[PDB]
């Protein structure tokens, strides 16, 4: 099941900041931040979790229609990175495809640990 | 300080699309899009911000010499509007004068909100 | 690419002098000052450059082994600030990680301007 996620993608993005990958990740948690709500995501690549993912607002209908929800597996097709003053890298998801629904997956995959910031 | 910006210019341009005004606006952010780089601008008129401003390339030396930079206040002397298939209006800045430098102004003026497209 | 650097970290350190951030910066230039040599660095956070960075001597092997070199991107993990009689703040880098090598990055990121001291 972990073989279904892009182990090391989070570490790669955090170290290199490159956007030339299309990682498959699991949504662990989604929270709105109140114009359209901004959704923040805690995502997993099976190895690490990271809470600095944000959704571009065009993707809000995926959340609102319950396609993108906790435990679902999705592939990221386009993202950008913005690095804050303090060093945290924020990953803004621009295009993504849900591969497998939350109910199809049904649980957290594996035992990912927070990325060490 | 907001009394220094042309409150309502952005809304006017977006609704009427007329070019017979010479609004004073604040640069909030500038990003190059890679011939000469094309600069895209998020500008404020104190009331609204709008991210569909573009710089004509003759104005590139103002950016490159750091005269036109984030937080500076400038007056637009000539612009054109192009409306995309999807309804967004792009404002291409042809002539402008920097009135007050970024360091002279030193902060975002007021609390402008994104124009509702 | 600028989204890879901690824009505003330099200004934050110069204004607040706080050390509770772990900024990602690009090395622009390194010069030894002649016990171990002391390396002085001109660093960039994408927005500003600043030439008052110094390396703690335990980090000298990173320079000597060519891991830390002009154009590389590194994250600062521990630093201290010392403010001179004249007002300049010196930033002494105690712990850092190279994220991306000089050859991987290959050029100056963006168009940072000197911090206005």
């Amino acid at each position: 099941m972990v073989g279904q996620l892009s182990e090391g993608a989070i570490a790669a993005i955090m170290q290199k900041g490159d956007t030339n990958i299309k990682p498959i990740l699991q949504v662990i948690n989604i929270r709105p931040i109140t114009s359209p709500p901004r959704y923040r995501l805690l995502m997993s690549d099976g190895l690490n979790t990271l809470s600095s993912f944000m959704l571009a607002t065009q993707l809000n209908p995926l959340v609102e229609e319950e396609q993108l929800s906790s435990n679902c597996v999705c592939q990221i097709h386009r993202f950008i990175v913005n690095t804050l003053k303090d060093g945290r890298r924020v990953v803004i998801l621009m295009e993504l495809e849900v591969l497998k629904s939350a109910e199809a997956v049904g649980v957290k995959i594996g035992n990912p640990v927070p990325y060490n910031e | 300080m907001v009394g220094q910006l042309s409150e309502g210019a952005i809304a006017a341009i977006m609704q009427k699309g007329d070019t017979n005004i010479k609004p004073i606006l604040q640069v909030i952010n500038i990003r190059p899009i890679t011939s000469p780089p094309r600069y895209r601008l998020l500008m404020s008129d104190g009331l609204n911000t709008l991210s569909s401003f573009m710089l004509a390339t003759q104005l590139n030396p103002l950016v490159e010499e750091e005269q036109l930079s984030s937080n500076c206040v400038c007056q637009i002397h000539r612009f054109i509007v192009n409306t995309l298939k999807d309804g967004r209006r792009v404002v291409i800045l042809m002539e402008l004068e920097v009135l007050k430098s970024a360091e002279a102004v030193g902060v975002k003026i007021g609390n402008p909100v994104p124009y509702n497209e | 690419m600028v989204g890879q650097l901690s824009e505003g970290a330099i200004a934050a350190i110069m204004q607040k002098g706080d050390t509770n951030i772990k900024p990602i910066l690009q090395v622009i230039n390194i010069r030894p000052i002649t016990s171990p040599p002391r390396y002085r660095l001109l660093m960039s956070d994408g927005l500003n450059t600043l030439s008052s960075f110094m390396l703690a001597t335990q980090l000298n092997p990173l320079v000597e082994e060519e891991q830390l070199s002009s154009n590389c991107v590194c994250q600062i993990h521990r630093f201290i600030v010392n403010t001179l009689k004249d007002g300049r703040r010196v930033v002494i880098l105690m712990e850092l990680e190279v994220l991306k090598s000089a050859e991987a990055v290959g050029v100056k990121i963006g168009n940072p301007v000197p911090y206005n001291e």
């Binding site: 931040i33 923040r40 600095s52 571009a56 003053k85 | 952010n29 990003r31 995309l84 975002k108 497209e117 | -």
Partner: peptide, 24 residues
């Protein structure tokens, strides 16, 4: 919104704006 030409608008986000998603 959402319009196709708004796809990449977050490229233009003020660096302060993003920080504030995390602190406010």
């Amino acid at each position: 919104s959402p319009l196709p030409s708004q796809a990449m608008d977050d490229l233009m986000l003020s660096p302060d704006d993003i920080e504030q998603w995390f602190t406010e």
